[model samples]
Target: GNRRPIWIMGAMVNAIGQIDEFVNLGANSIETDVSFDDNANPEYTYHGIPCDCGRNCKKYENFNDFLKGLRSATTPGNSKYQEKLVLVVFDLKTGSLYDNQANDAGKKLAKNLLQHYWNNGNNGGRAYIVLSIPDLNHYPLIKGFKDQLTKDGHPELMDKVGHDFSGNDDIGDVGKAYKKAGITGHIWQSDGITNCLPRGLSRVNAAVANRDSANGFINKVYYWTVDKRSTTRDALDAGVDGIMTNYPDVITDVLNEAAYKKKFRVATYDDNPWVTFK
Candidate 1:
């Protein structure tokens, strides 16, 4: 099936706030960074913006509580236009970044996600999980996480999980690594267009353009941290599969305008007094 570009909106920045505003903006996916408290509680800290001050931080006693609050604002009927996938980008603050330690963290996250959200079928199937690949070079981390989910007797849950390559500078390189590691074709993603542009956008464009060819991985593509209007416009124009942004309303308005313009073109094509007069 053909895929449409999705909006990956951000609710929590480097701090925990404005949960409902972003979700209500009709994003197709939402982004949040996860960490762990000293006592092992899930800390939903803001990881995008840079500031030493502790203004944009939040902690939940457990991952389940965090999931509860996220689902509280969502309902089956009210959120048909909203995102079905939750982008859980992991941060190293809560755990060690060493290969084994990071893989362990991934395993822990996969377990909690399966137990609380995936198995429960949040929002009656309106919501699912997409995890960040800790490192493209270390593809085993991604494999390790999926292995944990499978060993727990819910290998089917792997269907709900997607791998993100957002932090990497070059998605084409990541795609090759993913293919070689035997984890291609399951919703692959990368950073926003502008971030990779002026240098790496060519590779992104090449990969996206030749997506159906032998040089491509036929998985979905997504961009991250698109906050400005111009970049949003440019990213959409570049034909990325999805755009992640802190300003959901901004990107949604751009999308709405484009949609209306296309609709106007279609409307004008038919013979009508209003259309003919113009």
Candidate 2:
């Protein structure tokens, strides 16, 4: 289909209540943030400035529960509706920069993921669970988790999982670790990717240049928090592999219209959250 990328809902989903609506709107992938809770447990999802994010956190929308709702949608039973997915991204909010638990947050999260969705490397080909580490300081967060996977005799689980990195970071040691662990599926991203070619694509372009094959066995790029139709179109035109967004309908509509190649509105999109006239 004309280079349409995977639509990831970043509509800031921390709650199970929001899953069904976005899936219905055509999101094949979802993203959620994870940070340590008051007791130093990496579970609750939050939205705010770096310090004491608990104040803005969603108690009901923690990672453990959000993922439960995710599994229901991705792997429904006979009585339930079945909607397959391509990816599930967990953006780690645990680190010295965010909510430092000193250590163990990553392993705790790793096991939680293993039982909840990863299934000890046995996703049965459902969807890839991509762990994203945004800052270099967050390296220890995923670094520990990666070690635990192999230590628990589930190194093969790394195959079922993918690693995503923020474009701003160098990823020298982190990339080295993934390569040695035999983990494939590398995805580089920048929230800037939502803007356009010269502005956003250039960032990922530079990252790809450095970590190309050294990055993974398979490589792709994903942009974040894009909501406008024009930005989605621009991101698509730039040949990105995926997009994380709040409005999947915009990406859905853009993808549909692009595939159709309608003559009237070839590559035009409005800034409005919901478009009106065609």
lDDT of 2 at 210: 46
Clash-forming residue pairs, model 2? none
RMSD of each: 8.3, 8.1
Sequence-dependent TM-score of model 1: 0.71
Residue 178's lDDT in candidate 1? 72
Worst 10 residues of 1 by lDDT: 267-276
lDDT agreement with native, every candidate = 0.52, 0.56
- The sequence of per-residue lDDT tens digits that candidate 2 reaches over residues 80-198 is 33353556677776553343542366677777776666555554335556677665444555556777776788777665566666545544554664465445444444445322232
Question: What lDDT score is found at residue 171 in candidate 2?
Answer: 45
User: How high a TM-score does candidate 2 get?
Assistant: 0.71
Q: In model 1, which runs have C-alpha deviations exceeding 4 angstroms?
A: 1-3, 11-17, 36-62, 73-95, 119-125, 193-200, 210-214, 258-278
State TM-scores per candidate. 0.71, 0.71
* CA lDDT, candidate 2, residue 131: 71
Task: Name the regions of candidate 2 deviating beyond 4 angstroms.
Answer: 1-5, 38-40, 49-60, 76-82, 96-103, 118-125, 151-153, 170-185, 193-200, 207-218, 259-278
